[PDB]
Scaffold this active site. Sequence first.
Site, PDB file in Angstrom:
ATOM      1  N   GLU B   9       0.814  -1.205   0.000  1.00 33.70           N
ATOM      2  CA  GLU B   9       0.000   0.000   0.000  1.00 33.70           C
ATOM      3  C   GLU B   9       0.854   1.265   0.000  1.00 33.70           C
ATOM      4  O   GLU B   9       0.560   2.217  -0.726  1.00 33.70           O
ATOM      5  CB  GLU B   9      -0.937  -0.001   1.212  1.00 33.70           C
ATOM      6  CG  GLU B   9      -2.087  -0.993   1.085  1.00 33.70           C
ATOM      7  CD  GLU B   9      -2.924  -1.088   2.347  1.00 33.70           C
ATOM      8  OE1 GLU B   9      -3.211  -0.032   2.949  1.00 33.70           O
ATOM      9  OE2 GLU B   9      -3.303  -2.217   2.728  1.00 33.70           O
ATOM     10  N   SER B  29      -9.296  -0.033   6.325  1.00 30.69           N
ATOM     11  CA  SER B  29      -9.627  -0.556   4.999  1.00 30.69           C
ATOM     12  C   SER B  29     -10.987  -1.230   4.959  1.00 30.69           C
ATOM     13  O   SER B  29     -11.155  -2.258   4.302  1.00 30.69           O
ATOM     14  CB  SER B  29      -8.561  -1.559   4.542  1.00 30.69           C
ATOM     15  OG  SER B  29      -7.293  -0.937   4.411  1.00 30.69           O
ATOM     16  N   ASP B  33      -8.800   0.158   0.114  1.00 30.60           N
ATOM     17  CA  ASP B  33      -7.503   0.462   0.723  1.00 30.60           C
ATOM     18  C   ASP B  33      -7.054   1.904   0.472  1.00 30.60           C
ATOM     19  O   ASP B  33      -6.538   2.566   1.376  1.00 30.60           O
ATOM     20  CB  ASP B  33      -6.422  -0.493   0.200  1.00 30.60           C
ATOM     21  CG  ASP B  33      -6.687  -1.944   0.575  1.00 30.60           C
ATOM     22  OD1 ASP B  33      -6.894  -2.217   1.773  1.00 30.60           O
ATOM     23  OD2 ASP B  33      -6.674  -2.814  -0.323  1.00 30.60           O
ATOM     24  N   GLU B  46      -8.467  -1.438  -4.277  1.00 30.35           N
ATOM     25  CA  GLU B  46      -8.360  -2.599  -3.410  1.00 30.35           C
ATOM     26  C   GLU B  46      -6.998  -3.161  -3.789  1.00 30.35           C
ATOM     27  O   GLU B  46      -6.759  -3.485  -4.957  1.00 30.35           O
ATOM     28  CB  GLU B  46      -9.442  -3.631  -3.725  1.00 30.35           C
ATOM     29  CG  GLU B  46      -9.283  -4.934  -2.943  1.00 30.35           C
ATOM     30  CD  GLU B  46      -9.424  -4.753  -1.439  1.00 30.35           C
ATOM     31  OE1 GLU B  46      -9.860  -3.670  -0.991  1.00 30.35           O
ATOM     32  OE2 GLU B  46      -9.107  -5.703  -0.699  1.00 30.35           O
TER      33      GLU B  46
END
Lengths: 120, 114
Positions: B9, B29, B33, B46
């Site tokens: 991420e 999340s 995300d 995501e």
Amino acid sequence: MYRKGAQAERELIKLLEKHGFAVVRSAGSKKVDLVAGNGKKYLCIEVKVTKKDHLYVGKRDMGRLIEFSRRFGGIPVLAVKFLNVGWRFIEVSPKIEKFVFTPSSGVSLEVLLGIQKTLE
Amino acid sequence: MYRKGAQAERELIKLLEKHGFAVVRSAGSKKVDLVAGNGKKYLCIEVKVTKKDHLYVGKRDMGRLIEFSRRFGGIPVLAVKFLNVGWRFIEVSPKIEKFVFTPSSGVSLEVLLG
């Protein structure tokens, strides 16, 4: 953690969702506290809560919000919950500087969203 | 459990920023995300990570992404980081999926961003 802040934030999110907005909270409040979108409008929000009848907002904080909002493509919004009075929203202008806000300085969520000038 | 994902991420956030997007990482999340915007294109992402050369993506999982992106007003994107090979992206459609994603699936970030 800032417990009173988290409680106000939870309340605000439900209000936004009630109006059809999908909301995301930024981890650690990195650039902003929340980002909300309803398909046509995007809000980048900084949340504040106080028991006082006024609130000072530093130039840096103001700049961070305006900067992120401009890059993201959202309306820069300062959402304050003046305890014992209620929520007041201010769509901040591009001017990046200090400033003092009072409850009379902001509008209601309905007005922020422009519900008062929308037939339906 | 969440280490490789947390790392992916952070790396994707940098890649997007490098391309002019302002990005926020969703706390917990719950729905997605990341959410990114550059003023014209809005993305709800995501992020998946795997050490394998293939990944199974369920319909329900994608249904959540699509519904949130629909409400928010952003493009529902699945970002998969195949460890030791690279990133692949695909704009997910409301039509069910329950498919397998591989390093040749979807498109590159640059093409995703047009």
